[PDB]
Amino acid sequence: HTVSPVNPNAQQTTKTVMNWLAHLPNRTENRVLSGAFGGYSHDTFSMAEADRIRSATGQSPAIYGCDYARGWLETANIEDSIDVSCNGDLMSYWKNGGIPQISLHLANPAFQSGHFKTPITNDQYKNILDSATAEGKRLNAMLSKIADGLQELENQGVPVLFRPLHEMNGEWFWWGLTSYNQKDNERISLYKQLYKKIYHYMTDTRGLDHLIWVYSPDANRDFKTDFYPGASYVDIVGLDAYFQDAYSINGYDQLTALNKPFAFTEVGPQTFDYSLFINAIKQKYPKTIYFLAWNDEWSAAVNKGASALYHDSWTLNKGEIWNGDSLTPIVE
């Protein structure tokens, strides 16, 4: 069968990559893309983690991540928290046989700037969703700058794993719940409204056809599927998973039950041997199509088992996506 991006107008390369990703679990090898977070644009983003992995393993992560939004920063205009200068490196990563991933630690448009982990009321959340308000204008200012950045990548035909509004079932970011494991049906409904608002801004208003849309709840909180905006708005589902024991991560059955390709959209030690993580994928989470190790203390290069992780027969690394001018063959 053919798995198509939820954006029916998606670029051919993005279409081909999405279908290819969906068929990885039919393989006996090269069926889980490695990944690493490279950092926050114009703050911590660099190629240093990729290079540490090359040095330790002789291989590079298939996926390299950047985050555009430094949402803790106090700035004159809220959109100043967005920087897209990591694009050059992301485009080179694609040209050199990998794939970019972009997340957003968005500043909080309820307020003048910053406050990414300061909670808001449902009333404020409604203002944010209303383009006529001071709040909604701040959100749109941020979305416009993000889209300007994404446009750069679209112009070079670069598919992007785009992972907005993550960990929404957590109680830290402004866009999620306000209280630990406390259901709020209006908040859940408002989240879906915000997700769909961003989807339609990027896809319709800005015509961005190179985005693969990733839904990434936290593995250590309830309501993992309650926030799911639906089959027509999500390409890949996954867990942000920080754990001590790779074999007891919660949520795989629930998310795979949505019949979407599944990924470990973030991974790291909770505080650790990454070789046990790939082993656990084979036994417990076989439909995993990729993992993205976080940076700093969580990274593969600074923990045990980097070589075993990267050299495992299941692990698909930079340079193993393409065979010349076409993707490596699909197993149907």
Residues between 180 and 209 with contacts to Ca ion, criterion CB under 5 A: 207
Distance CA 243, CA 92 (A): 32
Nearer to Ca ion by Cβ, of 287 and 311: the residue is: 311
Q: Is 319 in the site for Ca ion (CB under 5 A)?
A: no
Instruction: Return the structure tokens found at 102.
Output: 């972009």
Backbone φ and ψ for 61, nearest 5 degrees, come out as -60, 140
- 242: annotated binding-site residue? yes
Nearer to Ca ion by Cβ, of 207 and 230: the residue is: 207
CA atoms within 13 A on the CB side of 147: 18
Q: Minimum Å distance from CB 21 to Zn ion?
A: 12
Catalytic residue (choose from 29, 135, 266, 320): 266
| 3-state class (DSSP) for residue 128 | helix
- 174: annotated binding-site residue? no
- 266 catalytic per annotation: yes
- 135 catalytic per annotation: no
Q: Minimum Å distance from CB 19 to Zn ion?
A: 8
- 172: annotated binding-site residue? yes
- 314: annotated binding-site residue? no
Instruction: Give the residues lining the site for Zn ion (CB under 5 A).
Output: 1, 332
Binding mask 26-45 for Ca ion (x = CB under 5 A): ----x---------------
Q: Is 8 in the site for Ca ion (CB under 5 A)?
A: no
Here the contacts of 128-136 (C-beta below 8 Å, separation 24 or greater) are 128/194, 129/190, 129/193, 129/194, 129/197, 135/109, 135/110, 136/109
Distance CA 67, CA 105 (A): 7
- 94: annotated binding-site residue? no
Residue entry with tokens 């949520």: 251
Instruction: Please check whether residue 259 is in contact with residue 232, taking contact to mean a CB–CB distance below 8 angstroms.
Output: no
Active-site amino acid positions: 167, 266
Binding-site residues for substrate, please? Answer: 105, 172, 242, 294-295
Binding-site residues, please? Answer: 105, 172, 242, 294-295
Contact residues for Ca ion, defined by CB under 5 A? 30, 207
